[PDB]
Structures are given as C-alpha cells and as structure tokens.
Amino acid sequence: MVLSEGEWQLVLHVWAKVEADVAGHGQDILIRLFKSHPETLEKFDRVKHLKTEAEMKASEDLKKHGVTVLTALGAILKKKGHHEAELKPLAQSHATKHKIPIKYLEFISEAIIHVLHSRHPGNFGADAQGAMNKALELFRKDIAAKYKELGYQG
Numbered sequence: 001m002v003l004s005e006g007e008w009q010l011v012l013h014v015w016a017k018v019e020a021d022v023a024g025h026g027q028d029i030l031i032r033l034f035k036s037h038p039e040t041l042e043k044f045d046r047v048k049h050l051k052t053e054a055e056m057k058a059s060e061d062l063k064k065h066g067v068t069v070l071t072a073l074g075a076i077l078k079k080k081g082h083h084e085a086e087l088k089p090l091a092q093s094h095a096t097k098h099k100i101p102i103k104y105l106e107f108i109s110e111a112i113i114h115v116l117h118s119r120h121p122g123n124f125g126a127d128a129q130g131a132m133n134k135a136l137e138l139f140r141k142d143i144a145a146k147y148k149e150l151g152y153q154g
C-alpha cells in the first residue's frame with residue numbers, strides 16, 4: 001500500500017498532538033488494550049499480575065512500556081512509509097523473543113484509534129481516522145511480511 005502526502009499530513013498532524021503528552025497517551029492506549037483484550041496482558045511478565053484499572057494507572061512499569069511503544073511507533077510514522085530499517089529489529093524481537101501475533105497488533109491498532117478519537121475529536125475526523133487506519137494497516141502488513149521471512153508469521 002502507499003499513502004498519499006495528504007494522508008501522511010493528517011496522520012502526522014494528530015500525532016504532533018499525541019507527542020505533547022507521550023506518557024499519558026501511552027497509559028490510555030495500553031490500559032484500553034488490556035481491558036478490551038485481557039489475553040494481551042499475559043505477554044508482559046512485568047505487569048501480568050495487575051488486576052484492576054487503578055493498579056494499571058499506578059504502575060510505573062506500564063507507563064514506561066507505553067512511552068517505549070509510542071516513541072517507536074512515532075519514529076516509524078515519521079518515515080512516511082520508508083521504514084524498512086526501523087522495522088527489522090522490531091520484527092525480530094516481536095517474532096522471536098516476545099512472540100506477538102499479528103492479531104495483537106490489530107488489537108493495539110484498535111486501541112490507538114479509540115484513544116485518538118476520544119482525546120482529539122477536532123483533529124480526528126473521518127478522513128484523519130481513515131489516514132491513521134491506512135498507516136497502521138501498512139505497518140501491520142510490513143511487519144507480517146518480515147515475520148514470514150524470520151520464520152514466525154505468527
């Protein structure tokens with residue numbers, strides 16, 4: 001797939017608002033993920049044990065994870081499709097070490113869209129949501145292909 005410049009602009013315009021508060025958005029997104037799809041929490045040996053949303057909010061380790069995920073995703077989106085170098089190490093750890101099925105990347109994509117929609121309604125109308133979904137589909141498609149080369153296509 002290929003986004004147009006206009007679609008990239010919509011994506012990077014709402015992302016610039018996310019970056020005003022990386023840790024807060026990280027928290028919202030992962031908590032939304034873990035509430036919606038509790039199986040995903042099992043992948044994090046560090047936060048596995050957390051039982052409630054209050055515990056999740058209070059967790060410093062969860063908030064670090066969120067910042068790590070969003071910073072890596074931000075660097076990828078800012079490449080505007082030319083992200084082959086950033087993807088390689090990421091596809092290798094998630095295929096071989098963490099073992100994150102593509103289905104889980106779909107779930108977090110849903111969580112990202114949900115949280116942007118709540119927090120940024122004026123900058124996240126239909127066309128901006130369409131452009132973000134396209135960017136995240138592109139990301140999942142390129143990851144899935146690398147998974148296959150690495151022997152996982154999990």
Ligand code: HEM
Nearest residue numbers: 040043044046068069072073090093094098100104105108
């Ligand atoms: C937008 C998607 C994602 C991005 C860009 C992302 C990025 C990263 C980065 C940069 C790290 C640390 C370096 C490394 O281990 O490669 C990491 C670690 C990890 N990721 Fe991902 N990730 C994403 C989605 C997921 C999802 C959906 C899950 C699980 C349901 C997941 C589970 C983990 C785990 C278990 C770690 C290691 C945590 C630890 O330090 O103990 N990731 N991720």
